[PDB]
Amino acid sequence: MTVEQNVLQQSAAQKHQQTFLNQLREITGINDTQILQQALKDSNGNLELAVAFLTAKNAKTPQQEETTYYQTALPGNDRYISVGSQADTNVIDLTGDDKDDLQRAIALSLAESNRAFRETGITDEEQAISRVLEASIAENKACLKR
Numbered sequence: 001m002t003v004e005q006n007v008l009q010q011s012a013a014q015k016h017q018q019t020f021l022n023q024l025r026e027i028t029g030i031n032d033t034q035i036l037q038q039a040l041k042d043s044n045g046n047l048e049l050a051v052a053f054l055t056a057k058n059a060k061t062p063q064q065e066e067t068t069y070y071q072t073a074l075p076g077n078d079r080y081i082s083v084g085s086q087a088d089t090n091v092i093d094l095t096g097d098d099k100d101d102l103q104r105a106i107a108l109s110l111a112e113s114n115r116a117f118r119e120t121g122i123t124d125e126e127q128a129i130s131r132v133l134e135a136s137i138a139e140n141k142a143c144l145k146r
Contacts, residue, residue: 023047030055
């Protein structure tokens with residue numbers, strides 16, 4: 001797939017800096033192309049030195065075996081900030097169980113009645129109008145010239 005070859009064309013003198021520098025990426029497992037050539041100018045042809053200028057601390061060998069050089073083969077990212085954590089709203093009530101409304105239906109009527117009534121009820125009006133007619137003599141005995 002990624003054959004480390006193809007077709008070489010001269011460039012022998014350059015083959016030196018290539019290998020030496022290439023190495024720097026191998027021993028210390030460094031991945032900086034700029035800091036490397038820099039480690040060379042200071043090493044003056046010294047490997048463990050150019051290496052030292054890069055790690056200048058510790059260093060092993062089985063760390064990261066030159067596997068690739070593109071998408072860092074990133075075999076995983078990591079948990080970011082955190083979850084969303086939405087609102088846990090789910091209480092209240094859509095209906096609110098309000099059956100007292102009808103209690104208003106009848107109630108309201110209880111009004112149209114206590115307002116349509118006449119406090120009386122016995123309807124003594126009949127006995128009245130009557131006693132009146134007679135007052136003037138309701139009917140008539142000896143009709144007039146009319």
